Design a protein around this ligand. Sequence first.
Ligand SMILES: [N+]
Lengths: 26, 26, 164, 166
Amino acid sequence: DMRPEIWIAQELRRXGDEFNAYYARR
Amino acid sequence: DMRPEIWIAQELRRXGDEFNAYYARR
Amino acid sequence: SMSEEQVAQDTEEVFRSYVFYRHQQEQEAEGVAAPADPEMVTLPLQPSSTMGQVGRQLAIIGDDINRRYDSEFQTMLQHLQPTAENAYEYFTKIATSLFESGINWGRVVALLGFGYRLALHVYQHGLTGFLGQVTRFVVDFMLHHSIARWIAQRGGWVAALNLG
Amino acid sequence: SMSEEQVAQDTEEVFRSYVFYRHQQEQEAEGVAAPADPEMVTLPLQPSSTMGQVGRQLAIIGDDINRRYDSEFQTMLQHLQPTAENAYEYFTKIATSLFESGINWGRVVALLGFGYRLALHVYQHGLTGFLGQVTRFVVDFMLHHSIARWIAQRGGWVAALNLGNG
Ligand SMILES: [N+]
């Protein structure tokens, strides 16, 4: 499947990129 | 690997059980 | 008195209303990530339906809990890769597993939520008109796997209005 | 007037303020059902300091976004099984992975969020005093892996003061 630390990194990136777009849209 | 439908069912169950515990009678 | 057949019939309006009002409130969320599904935005509903009330209420009171699972269901559905061709098979396996260790109201509502999330996935991957198919997935599973009977014996879907 | 070294020094207060305000807002939320972490409630902090304000800005803006990751992070951290002994290296490698394809302010905030979630998970699983360890994970990652210099070239942490207020 995936090591948990790789999975966490992938989801932190998704989440961070959603924050990044939110700061700009605001 | 756990089959994907099994993982989904496990988390559906967890989610449902969280709802069930939160909205308990009295 | 409330029969499993009446619960099965009521479930269609419960689910369709649940989908409409869940989508409505989610599309109002700050930082919402899922795009709008016009089939759910324009979904027509019966204006005075008690069952419509039930589905709306379940969507509303479930919002805090359900949204906490959003990212995980994105990951899980990307792995499952459901399509029109395998949706019945996987819906049935998932619903069966959901209730294997017992039935409770939260799991009943989670089945609705799964139907919602599956319908969104299929629309977002290109297929229109699938909401009627998932609606029947939900109703038929409940009728034939004793969930409608379970609800009936606890007063029917209006019993859900006492939750919270 | 800004340097990578200064940004790294400032990061400790930014992160500790972020932790305080994130915990406070989550404990105040209505549905919640989330157990309090007293180490995060009694954090000594100067709210009106500039770095205190930066941490607050980053905690309060768009907090609905990190709610959507709550259940997945429960699952993932249970699989990670962090400990006092393994967490520094896990944190550093996760952070390296996060920024491999680029640095942006949202990913910076996600790193703070991971520090928060990791600190909260480890406390709830019985280890006190771990917040000081996670704080250094965050600071030391930024110092030694480009992030503090990236922030410094953009004016320092004060450049984050108004993110999301357009
Ligand atoms: N697995």
